[PDB]
């Protein structure tokens, strides 16, 4: 629902949200789902993925 920020965060890409400690934040619903940092055993590449695009083995 609604959350509050414990730390400052400075954006690192064009898709992340910068915010300051104190800010109130509201979680938005997306078809993508939560994003996870993942490593591909298939390609060896690594980076964030949309969780709703995958399922357990």
Swiss-Prot record:
Which stretch of the full sequence is covered here? 85 to 140 of 533
State whether it acts alone or in a complex, and with which partners, per the record.
Answer: Forms a complex with polyoma virus middle T antigen. Interacts with AFAP-110. Interacts with GJA1 and PXN.
The record's tissue-specificity note reads: Expressed to high levels, and with a high degree of kinase activity, in certain fully differentiated cells such as neurons, platelets and macrophages. Isoform 1 is widely expressed. Isoform 2 is expressed only in the muscle.
Purpose? Non-receptor protein tyrosine kinase which is activated following engagement of many different classes of cellular receptors including immune response receptors, integrins and other adhesion receptors, receptor protein tyrosine kinases, G protein-coupled receptors as well as cytokine receptors. Participates in signaling pathways that control a diverse spectrum of biological activities including gene transcription, immune response, cell adhesion, cell cycle progression, apoptosis, migration, and transformation.
Q: Where does the record locate the signal sequence feature?
A: none
Q: Which residues form the SH3 domain?
A: 2-57
Q: Which organism is it from?
A: Gallus gallus
Q: How is it modified after translation?
A: The phosphorylated form is termed pp60c-src. S-nitrosylation is important for activation of its kinase activity.
Q: Where in the cell is it found?
A: Cell membrane; Mitochondrion inner membrane; Endosome membrane; Nucleus
> Which family does the record claim for this protein?
Belongs to the protein kinase superfamily. Tyr protein kinase family. SRC subfamily.
What protein is this chain from? Proto-oncogene tyrosine-protein kinase Src
**UniProt superkingdom:** Eukaryota
């Amino acid at each position: 629902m609604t959350f509050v920020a414990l730390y400052d965060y400075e954006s690192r890409t064009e898709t992340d949200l910068s915010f300051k400690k104190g800010e109130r934040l509201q979680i938005v619903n997306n078809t993508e789902g939560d994003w996870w940092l993942a490593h591909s055993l298939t390609t060896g590449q690594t980076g964030y993925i949309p969780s709703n695009y995958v399922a357990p083995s």
